[PDB]
A = this chain, B = another copy of it.
Amino acid sequence: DFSDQIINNSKKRYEYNLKFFTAGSDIELSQDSTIDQNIKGICTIKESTFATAFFEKVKGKEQYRCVVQPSGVATSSIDKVTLYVEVSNAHKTYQYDTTINLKIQLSPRQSTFILNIQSSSPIFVESSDNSLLSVQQISSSGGDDQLNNLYKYAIQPMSVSTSFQNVPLLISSADGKSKTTVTVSYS
């Protein structure tokens, strides 16, 4: 029972209630305080390292839950946060389970530099001056580069007749929030 707990913050726990039903008739088991249903279980995350999980019994009831806690902030390289849950009786005479989604310098001997930048969100890279400087994205035709989340930009003087200093290259994430500046010279 999700309780609308969309995973958006690592400084929160995501605490998902469990309900358990009869084989062949799908009737929910009695949650009463005179009973222990003798239930054990295990919760984990599958496919992704973005969160950890565990199984918990609500102290003083036949009420049970998954507790999930993120390790970081999500990247684009995460389709899903696959929850896994096993339940068994205290002796494991059976098991049953489920899976559910949750500076630079340039010269007449080195007229090109290559700026490598790692990011899971797309990256804009700009010159403040496109009359002294040339900037171009390099197309990674090997798939090895693409798996590394590694954006690449060629950086050049716009003429080999005009030396310059400290011209700011800009760098920004495609949500506008993360920004960096790299000053460039040609000599």
Q: Which residues of A contact B (CB under 8 A)?
A: 42, 46-50, 72, 75-80, 82, 84, 86, 89, 91-97, 105, 107, 109-110, 112-114, 116, 118, 120, 144, 147-150
Contact = CB atoms under 8 A, between A and B. Distances in A.
A51 to B, nearest CB: 10
A26 to B, nearest CB: 18
Contact of A147 (B47, B50, B84, B92): B92
Contacts of A94: 49, 72, 75
Given A86-B118, A109-B76, A110-B78, A93 B148 contact: no
Count copies of this chain in the complex. Answer: 2
Contacts of A95: 118, 120, 148-149
Given A86-B118, A95-B148, A97-B118, A109 B77 contact: yes
B114 A46 contact: yes
Nearest to A149: B95
Contact of A97 (B84, B114, B150): B150
16 contacts: A42-B148, A46-B116, A47-B112, A47-B113, A48-B93, A49-B93, A72-B94, A77-B109, A78-B109, A79-B105, A79-B107, A79-B109, A82-B114, A86-B150, A92-B147, A97-B150
Given A47-B114, A144-B42, A78 B93 contact: yes
